[PDB]
Write an enzyme that holds these catalytic residues in place. Structure first.
Site, short mmCIF file in Angstrom:
data_model
loop_
_atom_site.label_atom_id
_atom_site.label_comp_id
_atom_site.label_asym_id
_atom_site.label_seq_id
_atom_site.Cartn_x
_atom_site.Cartn_y
_atom_site.Cartn_z
N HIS A 53 0.81 -1.19 0.02
CA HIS A 53 0.02 0.00 -0.09
C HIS A 53 0.75 1.24 -0.05
O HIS A 53 0.59 2.35 -0.32
CB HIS A 53 -1.00 0.04 1.15
N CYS A 98 -0.06 1.16 10.00
CA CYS A 98 -0.10 0.27 8.88
C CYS A 98 1.41 -0.31 8.93
O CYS A 98 2.35 0.35 9.02
CB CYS A 98 -0.37 0.96 7.78
N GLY A 116 -1.64 5.63 11.11
CA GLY A 116 -0.07 5.52 11.09
C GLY A 116 0.65 4.15 11.52
O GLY A 116 1.74 4.03 11.44
#
Ligand SMILES: CCCCCn1cc2cc(Nc3cc(=O)n(Cc4ncn(C)n4)c(=O)n3Cc3cc(F)c(F)cc3F)c(Cl)cc2n1
Ligand SMILES: CCCCCn1cc2cc(Nc3cc(=O)n(Cc4ncn(C)n4)c(=O)n3Cc3cc(F)c(F)cc3F)c(Cl)cc2n1
Lengths: 300, 301
Positions: free
Chosen positions: A40, A144, A142
């Site tokens: 991502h 991830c 934040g």
């Protein structure tokens, strides 16, 4: 009597880095000379809804990736994508790399999460993989690329990399080979988790824990087959037991001298008749996020 | 975004844990710069443990009676002293993994992370609160003596607890890093009871605010109360007083959720008077009091 305990996080703290593409930033895991992170990161905001990751990646080169250990840049010398993870080869082998492996866990298994923001660890807690392949974590924007793990002797088994929060507030992610747990995909669209169920093997562990501690009113003089138990359990939104589950209850069964299928018959009576105003280990609720291994970890 | 007991990352403390042995008695120690801190109980033999005279026991020891092991490396002891219930062993090598640190004494209701260790090896990490009766409801087994509790701010570790013992009720007692017990306890192997415990009110209120932030609001009402009238009911139910400073500290959570502190108090009052009636809050059947307002702010924001 029992609480969620995490593994000490040091061995993992020394592997956390930040990865940035443009302004897109998240956490990665630095082991030997490779950094692993959610793919991502290569998404711009306009890509995030419906990314073409093959298309996005072929437009990237090594020099497009900013990897930082704190404020120290690690130069990227190679890149590839494996399922939903990005693998960046860097020119420095992490000197804090622990002995490690990558494992894919089953629902019911617990692990420690090291929640990180901008490559900086913030907190550590234990949680379980739900039967619907979500985790009831605690994660902010934040987070991830934060990882989940167990430690067995000196070896860190990484089992989870955090990708996304679902509409209901639960969390979804992948193993370290980038395969999602559950029917989720890495796109910023609303995806619903399937109906959740109770983790039977962990409820049984909790009943064993109660017996070990002398709370044993719920033991009866009946037994059941596994098949019959499984058929009944499903009617109360409990997961069926597998052969592996019976086996991991073996040590508790031996310690207490209570056969697994007798404990099943006890649980079956609790399901069918309720608690009738009584408590187990001081609680009217049956706990389903302590595994058989967690119980022996804490009792013994 | 979710709500769990969350500990501080333990790595900065892991690199400080060692094993200390005196004769056959062994426990954990904390190696900072060139000093190892551990419970003085380690100087006791089995028979000494029941009723120790520690100044006498210590005068009868020399440096070479102490074995300090950091993994498989032995650290040579070149000096010893006792500060209250803590032994301080000077060693001839500095710990390069020493973090920035301070020693702090915490107040009841404040929380901290525990790194449970056995034979100098870290085992687990979890969050605890100092109870009003100065016990902690830890998770500790035989051999955990000397494990430490801490908070981390930026890069600075504030050590606040050194584990000594388990009481007959299964709760835990220990000292600060200057060797003073929290509570009326002594470092002797004799049965010891604590004072009656109470519930940490400001923490319960913080946790109810977390519940609202996470969408669990069934318990809100629009009764109104004064601080004084809330405190009368709290006192009746063995809840600690709520002060104006506590109200002040809850201000940021009140502002976020739009719920005045005294309205949250009215909600708690009704929970105390009526019970939860088999409902849960954030998955709990009981009112949770081991999250501080700072803990909630940190995890929710
Ligand atoms: C300095 C200011 C931002 C710099 C610019 N910028 C914005 C960004 C947004 C992002 N997105 C997300 C971050 C994030 O932490 N979490 C997790 C989490 N878990 C609890 N919560 C609330 N969120 C999360 O669900 N997402 C969504 C998401 C992630 C996936 F991988 C995915 F496949 C699908 C998705 F919808 C990401 Cl990954 C990077 C970013 N960079
Ligand atoms: C390695 C092979 C030979 C080992 C030889 N040996 C035996 C020993 C026993 C000891 N004792 C205790 C260890 C211990 O871990 N905990 C903590 C804990 N917390 C949950 N539980 C159940 N226990 C604990 O309460 N004690 C008791 C105790 C400690 C104090 F500091 C104190 F002032 C008063 C006490 F009664 C100690 Cl300290 C050293 C030892 N060495």
């Amino acid at each position: 009597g029992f609480r969620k305990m995490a593994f000490p996080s040091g061995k993992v703290e020394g592997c956390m880095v930040q990865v940035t593409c443009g302004t897109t930033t998240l956490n990665g895991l630095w082991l030997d000379d490779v950094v692993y992170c959610p793919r991502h990161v290569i998404c711009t905001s306009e890509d995030m809804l419906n990314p073409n990751y093959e298309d996005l990646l072929i437009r990237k080169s090594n020099h497009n990736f900013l990897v930082q250990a704190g404020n120290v840049q690690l130069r990227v010398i190679g890149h590839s994508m494996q399922n939903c993870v990005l693998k960046l080869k860097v020119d420095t082998a992490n000197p804090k790399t622990p002995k490690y492996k990558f494992v894919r866990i089953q629902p019911g298994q617990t692990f420690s999460v090291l929640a990180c923001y901008n490559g900086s660890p913030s907190g550590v807690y234990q949680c379980a993989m739900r039967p619907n392949f979500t985790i009831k974590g605690s994660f902010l924007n934040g987070s991830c690329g934060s990882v989940g793990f167990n430690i067995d002797y000196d070896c860190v088994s990484f089992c989870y990399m955090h990708h996304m929060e679902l509409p209901t507030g639960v969390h979804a992610g992948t193993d370290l080979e980038g395969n999602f747990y559950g029917p989720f995909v890495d796109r910023q669209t609303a995806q619903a988790a399937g109906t959740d169920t109770t983790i039977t093997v962990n409820v049984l562990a909790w009943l064993y824990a109660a017996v070990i501690n002398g709370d044993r009113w719920f033991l009866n003089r009946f037994t059941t087959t596994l098949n019959d138990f499984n058929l009944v359990a499903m009617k109360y939104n409990y997961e069926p037991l597998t052969q592996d589950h019976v086996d991991i209850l073996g040590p508790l069964s031996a310690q207490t001298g209570i056969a697994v299928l007798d404990m099943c018959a006890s649980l079956k009576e609790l399901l069918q008749n309720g608690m009738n105003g009584r408590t187990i280990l001081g609680s009217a609720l049956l706990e389903d996020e302590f595994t058989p291994f967690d119980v022996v970890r804490q009792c013994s």
